[PDB]
Amino acid sequence: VVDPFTRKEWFDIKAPSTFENRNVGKTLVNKSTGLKSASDALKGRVVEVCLADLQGSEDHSFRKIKLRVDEVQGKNLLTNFHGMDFTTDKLRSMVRKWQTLIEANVTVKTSDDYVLRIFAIAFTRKQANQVKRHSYAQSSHIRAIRKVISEILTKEVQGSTLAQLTSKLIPEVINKEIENATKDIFPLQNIHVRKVKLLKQPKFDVGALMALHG
Amino acid sequence: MRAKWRKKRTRRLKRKRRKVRARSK
Amino acid sequence: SQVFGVARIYASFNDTFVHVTDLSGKETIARVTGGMKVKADRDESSPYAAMLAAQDVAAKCKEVGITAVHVKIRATGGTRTKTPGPGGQAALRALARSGLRIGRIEDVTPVPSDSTRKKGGRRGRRL
Amino acid sequence: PKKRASNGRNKKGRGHVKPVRCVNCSKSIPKDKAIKRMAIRNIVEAAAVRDLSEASVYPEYALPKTYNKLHYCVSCAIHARIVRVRSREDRKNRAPP
Amino acid sequence: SGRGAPLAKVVFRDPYKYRLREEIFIANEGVHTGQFIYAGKKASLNVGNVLPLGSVPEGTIVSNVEEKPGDRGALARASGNYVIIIGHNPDENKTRVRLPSGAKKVISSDARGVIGVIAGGGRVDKPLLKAGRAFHKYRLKRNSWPKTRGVAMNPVDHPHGGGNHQHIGKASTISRGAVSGQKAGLIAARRTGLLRG
Amino acid sequence: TPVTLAKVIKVLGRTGSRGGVTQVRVEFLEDTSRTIVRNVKGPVRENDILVLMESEREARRLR
Amino acid sequence: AKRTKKVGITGKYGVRYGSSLRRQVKKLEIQQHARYDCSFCGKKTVKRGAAGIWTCSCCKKTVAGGAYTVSTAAAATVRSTIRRLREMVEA
RNA sequence: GGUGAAAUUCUUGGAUUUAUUGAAGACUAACUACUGCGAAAGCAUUUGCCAAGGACGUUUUCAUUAAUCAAGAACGAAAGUUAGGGGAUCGAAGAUGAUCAGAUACCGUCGUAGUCUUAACCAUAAACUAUGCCGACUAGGGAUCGGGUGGUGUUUUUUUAAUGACCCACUCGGCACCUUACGAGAAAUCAAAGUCUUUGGGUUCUGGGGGGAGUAUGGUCGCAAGGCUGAAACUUAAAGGAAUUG
RNA sequence: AAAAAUGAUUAA
Ligand SMILES: [Mg+2]
Ligand SMILES: [Mg+2]
Ligand SMILES: [Mg+2]
Ligand SMILES: [Mg+2]
Ligand SMILES: [Mg+2]
Ligand SMILES: [Mg+2]
Ligand SMILES: [Mg+2]
Ligand SMILES: [Mg+2]
Ligand SMILES: [Mg+2]
Ligand SMILES: [Mg+2]
Ligand SMILES: [Mg+2]
């Protein structure tokens, strides 16, 4: 007999305070014993949590958020930002025919060494009183738009470091700034970043995450 | 018989003819 | 106030997987498939087998602690059919029968931007 | 004789398009020629919508959908009754209904 | 003479006595007369410079690599050969490299190498075409040419000797534990025959 | 043996290769909102009670 | 006039050693006896002394190169890799 | 795992299924259309560099410099050949499990060559619109791409500005569609396959009943595979196209 | 998406 489910500890997860309610959920690993036990084997965890779960607003039901466990004290797993991406059903909802898709991408680092790749998506818009059925762009508007996206995203990163990058990523204010900067070139339907991925990270920096948590 | 297989059979047969003339020359 | 887990229903053809893990996913709770309870070798993907597997999932889920789940429905994906098998709906059906609470249902089919030429040949699977 | 003015496909002006694979048999068929259908289906069946609504933490849940572009070869589309061979005069009708 | 790769002759100042010291390096591709070579821990990442393996990034191409620090070069010495730096382990002061034979190796990070690839590559791409060119090749190396086949000898001379036809007559795969005079053929062969059919 | 009882409220159609099976829509007597479709062997009218060994499957061979 | 149809410099070998071997030797001898631009003085004056040694008849610069050509493709890739790595380390 | 169903296969040496990564190679979904570009073959991630091109606008310039073209040339899918690199996937050969009367087929699991690339070859496809190229005229519409013109037009900026994006009316060029043929056609059908016994705008190429046969031979090109050019003897009353009824 | 080969000559 082994019955492995009787030697687990039921730890708890805490989000970083650049969100609403810190309660995420529960985890469990193994009994702490000799020979390099689970004091560190519980470190490398990533939790997928809905942004509506983290903010209590139903209209954030997409944009699922990564949270990476970085340090553990007591019965508490402190997590930091690890990435973001849209939900697949939301993506397939935006991507429809008789319109042009613009997908831009940048790789930039914040004030600290948080190098990270920001994506972005947009779709051309059928304006009012449009008899025309498709409303495609001219591949030069597309290039101009993608240039503006890259400029804006690089402007928003490498200043306003990761903590307040998340704090302004939550209310969807960046894509509004795209809406202002690109409304003169070509109308658009759905501007989003659609994904943030962290590439590599600096030294552990215990103070940053003890600053976020508490 | 299918035309492309007739062509393949003829090509093999022409290979054989060229080899037999190679024996004599 | 309810403890959450992840369902991770992989409903291919030829089989269905109901594979509950924690909210993170390194460790698992009661991975049971349709093929370990039907001896047909061909009913392994049947909705009945999937519903039985989900019931065994919930049976071992209780007295382990999970009470609600987020749902990740998966097809074979990649170059293959990328459509859910017949047992996925039944497995989710039975997980919701057995008292386990449901939230955040999503599809996790691996969808490729073209890669890895599909099997079957140029003329396809000729039947 | 020639069956269709657009031979069996939609290609007048380029010459080569690209091949896509049939979902059923993985037969290589040009994309302009493939029978393409949009499968937009609720992720849960109608027999389960009421149950998941009763068994959800989140009241008035979004009830997500699934989207899929299906590519069929001519043979699989006919065998699956996707296209259903038509009469000579009705063959010209392009209307989806 | 007898070496495919050319040799660079490099002059350094003696740090402790007033004089010059000649060193015979194996020349890397691109190194030219009148070029300045920089050797040391703080030397720059340029072709011809001599650096510790811990002072170069992964993917660096080096040559004349020391197996141990201070042995003055043992790996990737023949023409057109090089070592690829593939990783670092600063915890144990070690570096992983790929050798010309495809073998993976762990070396002290204090072992030195020369940035670049040994000059003279492509030499073996030219057929010799005739016995005399092999003759002149080996008269500058050693007395190993020409080679008589064992099966062309008598049994007194070779395990393959003898018989009323030329044939080996017993398996030519010889074990590791065979003794001197027995190791003629394919020693400790894991397999034989043409690879991939 | 948790044998359940169901009341047929709608007859859907006739299935099977030889047409020997009937599809019915049945609610339960304890709960009148737990409707399932079932496959029945013999002749069936409306307002009949079936005894089910198993009470979770959905009948196939629709439409 | 055209003295040979295809053997070129390998006409010195007559009919022996086989056509394929002679063609293989032909490509490398043409490379090996060719004159090359001097990267230092800008003149078509670089010739091979011995395998791997390339000397300019003016400015007398000698550079280590390939056995039968001044620069091999692998060597050019190595130079590009070293430049990329050095610039990455500096940036 | 896989199939009608199974078995070849892996599995307590933890297989399948999770999660954290890493490596390699190939490809570029959705957007993607009776849309675009290119002489054709073909061309779909972003950005930079290089040269090229059509159309449009033009009250710029030369002034017949043109059309089509034996000979002669460049390019030319896939497969295939030589050598180096690469070699994830899929997979002529092969292996192997099924099915079968037999299955050295279809189906399943593996898998060498290939698939990718560089330097060279090859020069063929239902390389098709099975419709040579240039020019003129003849019919009734709605769309769409690119350019240009105009507005008792609108629109996010100034709540009344170039612009960009839509609307309306035109126009030139293009991919194409819908109706009907007045016309043509053996018909299928065709806005050209019309302006044809009321037969002549210019010009290139090809065919002359079915087979033998794209064979034989000669020449020429290719490393080869083979390509290009290309008969005759003999044989035979049909072969063939479109449509009708069953 | 189980298996399913064959049918002498003339005779409108
Ligand atoms: Mg069929
Ligand atoms: Mg027909
Ligand atoms: Mg083509
Ligand atoms: Mg010998
Ligand atoms: Mg003898
Ligand atoms: Mg012996
Ligand atoms: Mg386009
Ligand atoms: Mg065609
Ligand atoms: Mg033709
Ligand atoms: Mg066009
Ligand atoms: Mg004739």
Q: Is the CB of C126 under 7 A from strand H?
A: yes
What letter represents residue A200's amino acid? K
Backbone angles phi, psi at E193, to 5 degrees: 85, 170
User: Does the CB of D91 fall within 7 Å of any strand H atom?
Assistant: no
3-state secondary structure F3-37: CEEEEEEEEEEEECCCCCEEEEEEEECCCCCCCEE
Which residues of chain D have a CB within 8 Å of the CB of C9?
Answer: none
Range of the structural domain that residue A36 is part of:
6-214
Give the pair of three-digit tokens for residue A10: 């039921």
Cβ atoms < 10 Å from Cβ of D62 = 15
Is A46 in the C-facing interface, judged by CB distances under 8 Å? yes
Domain count, chain C: 1
User: Ligand 3 centroid to D93 CA: how many Å?
Assistant: 27
**How far does Cα C73 stand from its chain's mean position?**
6
* Chain centroid offset of residue A181 CA: 23
Q: Do E80 and G79 touch (CB under 8 A)?
A: no
Q: Computed from CA positions of residues D46, D51, D55, D61, in that sequence, does the dihedral angle turn out positive or negative?
A: positive
Nearest CA in chain A to D39: A92
Q: Return the structure tokens found at D10.
A: 């939609």
Domains and CATH numbers, chain F: 1-63 (2.40.50.140)
N- to C-terminal Cα distance for chain B? 34
* Experimental approach taken: cryo-EM
* Distance separating alpha carbons of residues B16 and B22, to the nearest angstrom: 10
Which two three-digit tokens encode residue B11?
A: 């090509």
* CB D2 under 7 Å to nucleic chain H: yes
User: Cβ contacts (< 8 Å) between G78 and chain E: which residues?
Assistant: 29, 47, 61, 82, 116-117
CA atoms of E154 and E163, how far apart (whole Å): 8
Residue numbers of C between 64 and 93 with CB closer than 8 Å to F: 90
Please provide the DSSP assignment of G50-63 as one string.
STTEEEESSTT-EE
Answer positive or negative: Cα dihedral of D17, D22, D28, D29. negative
Does strand H come within 7 Å of the CB of A203?
no
DSSP calls for A136-189: ---SSHHHHHHHHHHHHHHHHSSSS-HHHHHHHHTTT-HHHHHHHHHTTT--BS
CA distance C89 to E103: 52
Residues C52/C34, Cβ–Cβ less than 8 Å: yes
Question: φ and ψ at E67, to 5 degrees?
Answer: -75, -40
> Does residue C71 contact residue C83 with C-beta atoms inside 8 Å?
no
- What are the CA-CA distances from residue C52 to residues C105, F38, F54, F56, F57 (Å)? 20, 18, 12, 10, 10
Using the CA of D25, which nucleotide's C1' is the nearest one?
A: I1
| Ligand with minimal distance to D2 CA | 2
- C contact test, residue of D20, D31, D43 with most C CBs within 10 A: D43
E172: Cα within 13 Å, side-chain hemisphere: 14
Q: Touching check for G59 and chain E: CB below 8 Å? A: no
In the numeric block, which tokens belong to residue A75?
Answer: 């019965």
| Domain CATH for C5 | 3.30.420.80
Query: Distance (Å) from the C-alpha of residue F53 to the closest C-alpha of chain C?
Result: 14
D76 touches strand I (CB under 7 A): yes
Q: Do chains E and G touch (3 or more CB pairs under 8 A)?
A: yes
Q: Tokens for E152, please give them.
A: 């062309």
| Closest by Cα among A118, E184, G67, D21 to C112 | D21
- The helix-helix angle for A174-182 and A141-156 (nearest 10°) equals 140
Between CA A44 and C1' H173 the distance (Å) reads 63
Beta carbons of C23 and A13 less than 8 angstroms apart: yes
Which ligand has the nearest atom to the CA of C127?
A: 1
Which of D67, D68, D69 to substitute to test the interface with A, most A CBs within 10 Å? D67
What is the Cα–Cα distance from B9 to B15, expressed in whole angstroms?
10
Q: How many Å does it take to go from CA D11 to C1' H210?
A: 37
Nucleotide nearest to D76 (CA to C1'): I1
In angstroms, rounded to a whole number, what is the distance separating the alpha carbons of residues E119 and A183? 59
Q: Tokens 């697949």 sit at which residue? A: A88
Q: C84 vs chain A: nearest CA distance in angstroms?
A: 15
CB of C119 lies under 7 Å from some atom of strand H? yes
Indicate the DSSP class of residue E28: B
Non-local (6+) Cβ contacts of D40 within 8 A are: D65, D66, D67, D68
Task: Please state, in angstroms and rounded to a whole number, the distance separating the CA atoms of residues A153 and A144.
Answer: 14
CA of E170 from ligand 6 middle (Å) equals 6
Phi-psi sector, A24: left (phi>0), alpha (psi -120 to 50), beta: alpha
G58 touches E at CB < 8 Å: no
Buried b (16+ CB within 10 A) or exposed e, G59-70: eebbbbbbbbbb
In this structure, the number of other CB atoms found within 10 A of the CB of residue G40 comes to: 15
For residue D14, give both structure tokens: 């380029």
* Cβ neighbour number for residue C120 with a 10 Å cutoff: 17
In angstroms, the CA F61 to CA F38 distance is: 10
**C123:D52 CB<8 A:** no
| Cis amide prior to E146 (ω within 30 degrees) | yes
Separation of CA D10 and ligand 10 centre (Å): 14
* A1 assigned to some structural domain: no
Which residues 50 to 89 of C reach strand H, CB within 7 A?
A: 72, 74, 79-80
DSSP, collapsed to helix, strand or coil, labels residue E19 as: coil
Q: Ligand 4 center to residue E173 CA distance, Å?
A: 19
Q: Are strands C16-21 and C9-11 parallel, antiparallel or unpaired?
A: antiparallel
Count of C-beta atoms within a 10 Å radius of residue D32: 17
Taking residue G77's Cβ as centre, other Cβ atoms within 10 Å add up to: 12
Measured in whole angstroms, how far is the alpha carbon of residue A82 from the centre of its chain? 8
Q: Taking CB atoms and an 8 Å limit, are G78 and E61 in contact across chains? A: yes
Residues C32 and A173: their CA atoms lie apart, in Å, by 45
Which residue in this structure is represented by tokens 């006039």?
G1
Contact A66, A83 (CB under 8 A): yes
D7 CB contact with strand H at below 7 Å = yes
Which residue(s) pair with C60 in the sheet? none
- The DSSP element (H or E) to which G26 belongs, if any, is helix G19-33
| Cα-trace Rg, chain A | 21
Number of domains in chain A: 1
Q: Which residue is nearest to nucleotide H88 (CA to C1')?
A: C116
Distance in Å from H92's C1' to C80's CA comes to: 24
| Kind and range of the H or E run holding A70 | strand A64-73
Decide if A141 is inside a domain: yes
Number of residues that make up chain A: 214
Q: How far is CA E60 from CA A53, A67, C16, E93, E142, in A?
A: 47, 36, 48, 17, 35
Residue C68 and residue D57: Cβ atoms within 8 Å?
yes
Euclidean distance between CA atoms C20 and C5, whole angstroms: 7
G75 in E contact zone (CB under 8 Å) = yes
The alpha carbon of D84 and the centre of ligand 2 are apart by a number of angstroms equal to 18
A192, A86 contact by CB (below 8 A): yes
Question: Can you give the residue range of the structural domain that contains C90?
Answer: 1-127
